[PDB]
Amino acid sequence: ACVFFCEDVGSNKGAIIGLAV
Amino acid sequence: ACVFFCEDVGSNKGAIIGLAV
Amino acid sequence: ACVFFCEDVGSNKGAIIGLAV
Amino acid sequence: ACVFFCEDVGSNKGAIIGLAV
Amino acid sequence: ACVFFCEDVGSNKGAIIGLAV
Amino acid sequence: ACVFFCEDVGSNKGAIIGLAV
Amino acid sequence: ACVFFCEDVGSNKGAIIGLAV
Amino acid sequence: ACVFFCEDVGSNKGAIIGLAV
Amino acid sequence: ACVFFCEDVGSNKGAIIGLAV
Amino acid sequence: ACVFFCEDVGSNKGAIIGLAV
Amino acid sequence: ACVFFCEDVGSNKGAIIGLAV
Amino acid sequence: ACVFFCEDVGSNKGAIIGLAV
């Protein structure tokens, strides 16, 4: 899998986290 | 806006994320 | 302290975050 | 949205920047 | 000086670049 | 192209690498 | 090729960018 | 798990890769 | 706190370092 | 020595790793 | 060995650098 | 100019810093 660096929609500040896809 | 790499306050968690400002 | 990159235990969508250790 | 680290197309410049998607 | 990672307003794609301040 | 961070399929020790996509 | 981080000659606001060398 | 950035001893160039631990 | 990248005042060889702000 | 972030030549793999020089 | 991104102790300086371990 | 990420020889720990060249 790969890590996407995306805003967390489950965060009221749209913090950019790593998403493991 | 800017993206800064910061520890998210308010917790013990120690998470460092991209904050959009 | 150092910046670690770890899976966020508890997160429900396989998140990877910086961590201040 | 996500931020990817990509070479900006269309040029010779070779610039790599954060693209917001 | 420091490098801020910010959207370029002189870019029609808001590409995130390093700004030297 | 963009820099992706993905697991290295085939690698025997769970390696994560940049990938030029 | 390698990712270099260099000042963008020509840019009018002291920009620093990745560069594919 | 976390990603350690370490030389690969299974590489004759000691390339630094992400190790998933 | 956030990771800034700044010139190291005092350093005699134009060093750029992370800075915990 | 320096660490550069480069695509490892010789292959199709597209791996980008830290090279020590 | 590994490279970690850590604040260098012993000072007020707040410098974050790559430590080789 | 560009930033090289190199061990500081004026450091007894060979810490990797950004060198402005």
Residue numbers in the entry:
A (entry chain C), B (entry chain A), C (entry chain B), D (entry chain A), E (entry chain C), F (entry chain B), ...: 1 to 21
Passage from the reporting paper:
In Alzheimer’s disease, the Aβ peptide self-assembles to form oligomers and fibrils. β-Hairpins have emerged as important structural motifs adopted by the Aβ peptide in both the oligomeric and fibrillar state.75−78 β-Hairpins are the simplest type of β-sheet, comprising two antiparallel hydrogen-bonded β-strands connected by a loop. Using this approach, we have discovered that β-hairpin peptides that mimic Aβ17–36 β-hairpins assemble to form triangular trimers that further assemble to form higher-order oligomers, such as hexamers and dodecamers. In this paper, we use the approach above to study the Aβ oligomer model 2AT-L, a covalently stabilized triangular trimer composed of Aβ17–36 β-hairpin peptides.
We designed 2AT-L as a covalently stabilized analogue of a triangular trimer formed by 2AM-L. The design of 2AT-L is based on the previously reported X-ray crystallographic structures of triangular trimers composed of β-hairpin peptides derived from Aβ17–36.88−90 At the three corners of these triangular trimers, Leu17 of one monomer subunit is near Ala21 of an adjacent monomer subunit. To stabilize 2AM-L into a triangular trimer, we mutated Leu17 and Ala21 to cysteine to create 2AM-LCC. The X-ray crystallographic structure reveals that 2AT-L is composed of three folded β-hairpins that are cross-linked together in the envisioned manner, in which Cys17 on one monomer forms a disulfide bond with Cys21 of the adjacent monomer at each corner. The Aβ17–23 and Aβ30–36 β-strands of the three β-hairpins that comprise 2AT-L consist mainly of residues from the hydrophobic central and C-terminal regions of Aβ, creating two hydrophobic surfaces on 2AT-L. The three hydrophilic Aβ24–29 loops extend off the hydrophobic core of 2AT-L. In the crystal lattice, four copies of 2AT-L assemble to form a ball-shaped dodecamer. The dodecamer is stabilized by an edge-to-edge hydrogen-bonding network between the backbones of adjacent trimers and by hydrophobic packing at the core of the dodecamer between the surfaces of the trimers that contain Val18, Phe20, and Ile31. The outer surface of the dodecamer displays the hydrophobic amino acids on the other surface of the trimer—Phe19, Ile32, Leu34, and Val36, as well as the disulfide bond between Cys17 and Cys21. In the crystal lattice, six dodecamers pack together to form an annular pore-like structure.
